[PDB]
Structures are given as structure tokens and as C-alpha cells.
Amino acid sequence: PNIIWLVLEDISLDLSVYGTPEVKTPNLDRLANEGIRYNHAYATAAVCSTARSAFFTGMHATSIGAQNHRSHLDDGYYLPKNIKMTSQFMREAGYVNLLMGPKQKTDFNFSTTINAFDAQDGAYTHAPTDLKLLERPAWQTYIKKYSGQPFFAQINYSETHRTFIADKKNPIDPSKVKIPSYYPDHDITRRDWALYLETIQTVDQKVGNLFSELEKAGVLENTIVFIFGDHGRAMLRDKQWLYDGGLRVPLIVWGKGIESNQVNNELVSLIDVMPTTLDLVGLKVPDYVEGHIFLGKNKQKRDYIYAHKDRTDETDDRVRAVRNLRFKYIKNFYPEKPYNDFNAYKHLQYPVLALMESMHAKKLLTHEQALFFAPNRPQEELYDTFNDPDEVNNLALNKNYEEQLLTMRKELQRWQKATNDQGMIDETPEVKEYWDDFFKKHYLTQMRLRGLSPKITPDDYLIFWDKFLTEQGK
Amino acid sequence: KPNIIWLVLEDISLDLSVYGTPEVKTPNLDRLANEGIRYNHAYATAAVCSTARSAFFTGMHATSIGAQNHRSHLDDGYYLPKNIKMTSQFMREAGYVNLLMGPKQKTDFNFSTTINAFDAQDGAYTHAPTDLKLLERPAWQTYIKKYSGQPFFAQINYSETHRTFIADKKNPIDPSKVKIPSYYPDHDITRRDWALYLETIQTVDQKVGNLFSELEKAGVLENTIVFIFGDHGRAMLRDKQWLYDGGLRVPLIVWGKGIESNQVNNELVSLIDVMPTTLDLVGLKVPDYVEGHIFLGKNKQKRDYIYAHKDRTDETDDRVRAVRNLRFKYIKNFYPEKPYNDFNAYKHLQYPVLALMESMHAKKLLTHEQALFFAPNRPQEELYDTFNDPDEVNNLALNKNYEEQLLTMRKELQRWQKATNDQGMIDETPEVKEYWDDFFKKHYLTQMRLRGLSPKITPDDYLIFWDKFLTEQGK
Ligand SMILES: [Ca+2]
Ligand SMILES: [Ca+2]
């Protein structure tokens, strides 16, 4: 079978098929209903490079030294020889490996000395929906230079990363969207959210167009497709953080031989996609691989999933998470750091951060919304996600949950030792200072293009954000 | 031919005891004033280092010589126009050797030269101990070894009273007793910062006493005339960089040979008048191009007005001009849409009261007078009756009872700009503006991280830092 990994950016379970109001996602809904829809799939981290380094190797990024977003780009650090890329396994089974889709990035926090792919095509701005992915160089090279070989293709879209784009074919009514309780119920929040869902509608159209191309090529009879987000949506407490908003992603498995109308509620981590793919194409998974096979007779159930947060751009941190089907455990190794520690990306791109800072100063946030704006953090957080799906009622200090807290604390310690978590080793001063310098130059370049002061007050910034949203179309 | 000293203090308003300032102890500067001529109406032509100093070293407004942007023309082949001489070129012509002395070994010119500004030299500020021995440093040692047969012109630059302010633990000032202008909040943060400013004045007063004892022992004082003056007004939020009297009005004392004691002068003097007056004292004619007036002696020429300007200040772009007679201040903001509180890294990094006022403004706690600086835009014209409004907080420009005075001063500014061919009316290049905007906004992010602070820190969080900073300073 050919294998496709169709990777969406920065998206939570916000498709219509997952129960989300107002959004129109017919093509992804149809793929889900025609195959298996997963309700408990989790990335191992909540930004691009660490989620993607992980799922392309079947290993948590912390196990392979890739835990800092970004790092090891040009310093002679190579993936350890025992750790193979997905494409090395597929090459062994006779596959040709293709990098397709507008996002021609691997986002690895390491170099390699063999190519990750055999052929490739080449704030983001999303390209028109009428893209013809199969007429670009990766696919053209495949069909012309390779005969009788199955393909493994990673197809990366830029949606739904910011900047969000309007969908004037089916515009979304901001007053009707469902907002998590940890953002303010406010016009700014809802307009930004409406554009997020309209960006999902835009990529949904693109997925429909891809499948039209694939059917026309005649490859849909012997192709299995994994569709999944790299991590959760680009909203303030979701992306970069280890709550369900940052970790839980759509995951659909589809193709001839995959029975339709299945819904799966078992724990899956994105590092499971590689071993499951190997198993699907007849390969044994090496013992070193941390991911589990989640489909077929060889599946291995999980008791837990795990995730990490280490440096993110210039913002240093050290956070770990353990989740079973019911409980989320989070450990902040640096409790003295605020959650809202300076991050240029969040301040530059997220109108709701300005909104919440403005409202926090005026004492207008709800109790649940204000938790993110405390000056420091509890060392441990424990959430009963059955009774508290938005993870705003920390149970870690409630002695009635202490046995559960200690179980999960102990599991995190066991896991860190078994995987030799490399995020426990500080980065060098030269590296941290480099990225401090990098994101000061980026911040100021971007704030300059807007004519705003680097020290702009939240209320003045909101004037800008209202105009920005109006120009986006909401 | 008498020796000439220009003793230049940094960033200081009329805040000496002899000018009527409570609590501060300035016995040495007081005595110098009382032993000579004290000037009550001396004004810089700009309110930051390079533009005021480029001006007083040439007798020309900085705008007349292309030096109006602080800083600029450091390394681009821009030279002082050949008709414009530096003070030291005139003094060289009269047989003087020119000495650059004091801890601040800088000229701060917004232009290059092809002739040295001085003949001998020694070599956030941190102020050196009061026991400094300026005559034991290389400028004076060179003078006495190589040129003792010539009269000297010396510019002696102190670092006080620029920030960071330094505590004076020998005569500590009680913050609860200092006199604060009405446009800053009567608040502990304001008063602690202000007490340290006044203790920094006390520190430089001690140094000035030590300098005069050393000059006396050197045997040169009998044949020396000394001009003591600030380069512009005090390093407080609405004073330095701005064209209110807090930014422009400076101590000025003339003392020594031929200078009769116990004289007080209430006439308009601009710092560009110091050079022509010095030329006249040493027996030179002043060329007609010089914009400064001789203010002392038989050739004195009275002023009707003084003038000042504000153009780019570090990264902050602006265009402001001022005209002042003895009574009225006129200020024209050429870019009224810009707020007064346009981002300036220096003010945000160095001024605790900026964080205090931003915090208080957000809580609606500033008085009406204090809130004027925090408006989102400016009136194109400001007019103040300084006799009745010495803090310049009651703008009369929209009061038709003062329109004749407004139009008189408006017209004088236009006349002056046309007569002097004001170069600040010509935009700087994009390459220059972008260079400095980057340079300083980088500096802001850098120093904020070094203090462990976010560049977007709230004013109230910044005030937690500023309290600890003041405590570490000693107040
Ligand atoms: Ca992503
Ligand atoms: Ca100065």
C-alpha cells in the first residue's frame, strides 16, 4: 500500500465531525466517517519542531535531543545512528519518499547525513485553495523516475497556522462559536476564533481538492492515509502548552481495507504513527522505538501519553506532562516563572493576549481566565478531564486526589529515567543568547512593520488588533 | 591675556541653593555665584548633550550647522561648514593652548572635524569619587610640561548630574522635604529619585570645591575667568529632551579676573552666547556670522529672545521649536499627531518616574497638570506666561486674549527659521533613521532582559524593580 501522512498545522478537535458548531468541514468529516476517527490522539509537544521531530522518528523529542524549539540546526548534531527516520524504514521496504504540500519544511531539531525524502517540491500567508499539488516537482519526479515502487508521502499544509484567513464562501458568525472557558467571552476573542475556524474551512477545501487529484491519478485504491494535526490550535493557552488544547489533535485513518464508521477512544500519541505505518507495510518495529502500534492485530495499548515543553523560541521553560484517559498531570520544573513569560510570537500574533492583559489589569478576567496570568505556577497540576475538560480546576492540592497525583508523579519520574530525558540538561549560554538575539531582532522588525512601540500598552495594542481583524475580514 | 575655563556640568536645572532650592547643600557653587555674576535667565539651545554642546562650542544653534539630530554625522564625512569655526580655533588664534579636562572626555559633536578640537586631553554614567585630582591627569600635566608660557582655554566636563544618580551619605537629603514641580506626582518614588538627583548635585559641588583648591594651589586663579554652566536642564522626564524651562534653563556663573562680586543678572542669555563673550574677553572680534550675543562688557548686545529646538533624540523622531522672551514661552510642535510620550529607550530605561506616571495614568490618578504629558497628541502651538505659570502647565495658545502674543512669537519663529536656514526642516535619510531606531530599541530589549524584566513589563511590575533600584542607590 502507498502511505500518506497528511499533516495539518496547529489544529485542535475543531472539525464539524468532532462536534464543533458552525464550522463547515465536509471533506475531513467524510474521511473520518469513511474510516477510523480518533478522539484521544496527542502530540508529544505543542510546537512544530518538537512535535514533528518526534512523529517522524517514533521517539519523544527529549529522548533524541530535539526538545528545544528550535535547536541543532547547524552545529554538527546528527540524529543518533540507532534512531532512524521514518523514511529510512520505508526505503528499506522499497518505498520512495515524497515531501509534498505547500509547507516544504521538516522542522527537525537536528541535521541528518542522508536525505529525509527522495523527492520534494522545493506569520504565514495561506495560498489559494486551487493548488495542484500533484503537478509540483515531488509527485512529477515520482511518476516519471520511479516505476513499480509504492510511495510514502508527507503532505504538509500551512493551515491552520496564523495568520488566519477569511472564508467568504461560508463566513462564520462570531456570536455563535464555542469558546473555551479560559478565554474571555468577548468580541475580540470571537472574531479571532471565527477566522481560525474559517481557516479550517479553507484547508478542508484543499483536502477535498487533493483527494480529487489522487482519485484522478488512480492511487486511492491502494493508499492508506493518516490525517492529523502536528499539535493543537494557535490560541494563547493551547499551542506551546501541555493542556489538551495544545496536545490533542484530529487523527483519521482512511483507506481501502480500513472499515468505515469506526470511532476510537483509546490513547494514541503521535509517536505511534511511525510504528503503526511500519506495521501496516509489513515491517517489524525495532525494540528501541518508543511509539506503540495502535491498529491491527499487533496493536499495543497505552496506559499513558507524555509530552514536554522546553525552550520555545526565546522563552526558556521546563514542563512535563503525563496523561491517562481521565487525568492530566503537569509538572512545572521552574515554578517561579509565570506562564505569561515573554514570548515574541505570542505577543506579535495573538490578539487575545493583548485582550487578556488589558482585562487582567482592570480585574475583568474570570477566575478561570486569570489562572494563566498569575506571577508564578504551582509545581504540579492535576486535572480530572472527565469533570473538567477545560483543565481549569487544579486538583494537586486536594488531598482526596493525592494518591492519583503520586501515581502520576511517580510515572513521570520513571519515564524520565527510562528515556534519559535530555531536556534535563541545560542548553549552553551561547545558544540561549543567540535565540534571545534572534527574537529581539525578529520582534523589533515585526513591530516596526506595524508602526507600533515595542512597549505598547495592552489597550493601545487592542486598537491595532481591532483594525487588523477588520482587515482580515471579521 | 587671561586663562579661560568653561566648567560644564551635565543635566542640571536652577537647583542650586543660591538659586533658592530648598534642602540641597551647594556651598562651593553658591560661593562662586556670590563672588561673581549669577545669571537667572541662561538657556541652552537644545535639551540633550550633543545638540547643546555642538551649539555652545560654535556660537551657533545646532540647526544652523546641521548638527540638530542627537546623535548624527558621527562618521559620514560631514564636516563643520568651513565658515564655522570651533571655539578653540579662535583661542588658538589668540595664542591659547586648548585643554579638554574633567571625567567626561567627550565633545559630543554631531559632525566631524579635520582640525583637533583640543590640543591636549586626559584620554548611564557612574560618577567617580569626589577625591579626583583633575590637575594630575594628562591634559594639565601636558600643559605645564610643554606649554606653561601660553594662556590656556580649558573645558572641564563633569559627569554629574547625569544618571545614574549617586547618593551623598555625608549630607543625605530628606525626600519628604524636597521641592517637586507640579507636573510630577507628589509621591515617594518621585521624591526618592529627586533626593538622589539633589545629592548628585551636592557631589559635584564637592568636586568643584576640590577643583578650585587645586587651581588656587597651582597659582593660576588670579589671571583666570571661569564660566560655570550646565549643558541643559535636569535629567527628569519632562525636563531633559523637552523645550520647557526645565529642559533649557541652566545655572550660569561668571567668576574671576575683572569680575566684580555680588552681581545678579536677569537678562536673556543663550549658551551660544558663551563663545562670543569669551572671544571678546580675550581681545578678539566676533565674526558677523556668529549667532550668539556678547553678554558681558562694553560690547554687550541685548537679546529680545532665545531660541531652542528638538529634532531626533536617540531614536525618537520629533520636530519642535521654541521662542522665549523674558516673560513668554512659545513652543511649536511640527508633528502634533505624535504623543509627547513617544517611545524613547533612554527615558524608559533610566527614569523611575516614567513608570510611576504610566501606572498612575492608567489608574486615572494623575492630576490634570501631570496628565498633559500623557495625551495621545499635542497642540500644534503652546504658549506660557512664565511669570504667572512658572511650571508651564497652562497653555494659553487657544485663549484669544493672548493671540496677539501668540502671533508675534509665531512670526518670530518663522523669521528666525528663514534667517538661520534651519536644517532641522530637512528630513534625515531612511538609512539613518532606521539605523538608530534599531540601535536603541535593541538597547531597550537588551537592558530589560539584563535586569530580568520583560520588554512588555507592566508599569506596576516595573515599579517593583524601580523601588529596589532606588534602595540600592541609597534612598
Ligand atoms: Ca505546527
Ligand atoms: Ca547633558
Side-chain angles (χ1 to χ4, degrees), chain A residues 8-11 46-49 51-52 107 161 229-232 239:
Chain A
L8 310 173
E9 284 271 51
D10 306 20
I11 185 171
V47 294
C48 297
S49 61
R52 288 165 184 268
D107 288 349
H161 194 289
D230 69 328
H231 54 71
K239 184 183 178 178

Side-chain angles (χ1 to χ4, degrees), chain A residues 342 347 357 433 436 439 441 443-445 448 452-458, chain B residues 343 348 358 430 433-434 437-438 441 444-445 448-449 454-455 457 462:
Chain A
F342 185 76
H347 275 287
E357 290 191 338
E433 289 163 21
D436 298 333
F439 285 100
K441 296 171 167 148
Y443 179 65
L444 295 171
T445 295
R448 165 123 182 115
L452 309 173
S453 161
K455 192 162 202 156
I456 190 174
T457 72
Chain B
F343 183 81
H348 280 286
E358 287 195 343
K433 289 160 110 163
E434 288 165 16
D437 183 73
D438 189 62
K441 283 166 173 177
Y444 175 73
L445 263 52
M448 291 310 272
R449 168 182 166 289
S454 160
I457 186 171
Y462 207 2

Side-chain angles (χ1 to χ4, degrees), chain B residues 138-145 147-256 258-297 299 301-364:
Chain B
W140 185 256
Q141 295 297 297
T142 296
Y143 171 69
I144 64 170
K145 283 307 180 98
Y147 311 93
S148 53
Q150 293 182 252
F152 63 87
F153 167 63
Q155 187 173 333
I156 305 181
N157 290 313
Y158 285 92
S159 64
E160 302 84 357
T161 58
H162 199 282
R163 297 172 179 270
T164 307
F165 300 147
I166 188 166
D168 175 358
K169 289 303 172 182
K170 343 210 179 81
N171 282 276
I173 293 189
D174 180 345
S176 75
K177 286 178 178 193
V178 302
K179 177 176 199 218
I180 298 298
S182 61
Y183 46 83
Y184 303 126
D186 196 328
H187 187 285
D188 281 342
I189 289 288
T190 310
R191 293 179 161 280
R192 290 158 71 198
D193 181 56
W194 197 276
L196 285 165
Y197 161 59
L198 293 180
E199 291 177 15
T200 307
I201 297 183
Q202 292 184 167
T203 297
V204 80
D205 192 84
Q206 292 170 38
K207 294 178 172 186
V208 167
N210 292 339
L211 170 74
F212 272 80
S213 296
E214 290 145 29
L215 290 164
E216 187 172 14
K217 294 180 169 280
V220 299
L221 274 190
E222 286 316 288
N223 193 35
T224 300
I225 299 163
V226 184
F227 295 75
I228 307 108
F229 54 98
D231 71 329
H232 55 70
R234 64 175 86 99
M236 297 288 176
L237 170 66
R238 208 204 69 165
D239 300 316
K240 175 177 185 182
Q241 303 179 340
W242 293 99
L243 309 183
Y244 304 105
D245 282 358
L248 300 182
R249 215 160 157 185
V250 297
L252 170 63
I253 298 157
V254 173
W255 176 102
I259 307 296
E260 295 190 271
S261 68
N262 314 109
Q263 299 188 77
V264 177
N265 176 294
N266 289 297
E267 301 304 327
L268 291 170
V269 176
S270 184
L271 290 185
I272 57 162
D273 302 345
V274 172
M275 183 190 86
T277 301
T278 293
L279 268 55
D280 189 81
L281 281 169
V282 308
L284 299 167
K285 295 169 177 316
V286 181
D288 291 84
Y289 78 83
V290 169
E291 292 173 351
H293 293 219
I294 298 167
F295 64 84
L296 177 65
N299 297 314
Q301 179 192 4
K302 204 203 280 292
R303 286 185 164 273
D304 294 320
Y305 300 101
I306 58 92
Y307 311 85
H309 67 97
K310 181 183 186 272
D311 295 281
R312 172 167 57 77
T313 69
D314 305 318
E315 77 267 41
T316 306
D317 191 22
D318 207 350
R319 186 172 283 171
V320 192
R321 299 289 183 275
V323 180
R324 199 199 194 286
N325 66 18
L326 283 165
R327 179 172 189 202
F328 283 100
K329 175 76 64 63
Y330 168 84
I331 299 173
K332 182 178 167 175
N333 299 293
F334 285 68
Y335 303 150
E337 79 285 350
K338 298 184 175 301
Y340 295 110
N341 192 29
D342 216 349
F343 183 81
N344 182 257
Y346 162 69
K347 286 296 174 66
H348 280 286
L349 287 168
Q350 296 274 270
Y351 288 57
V353 171
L354 183 47
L356 175 72
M357 295 191 82
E358 287 195 343
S359 168
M360 292 177 77
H361 188 54
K363 304 167 180 49
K364 301 179 105 52

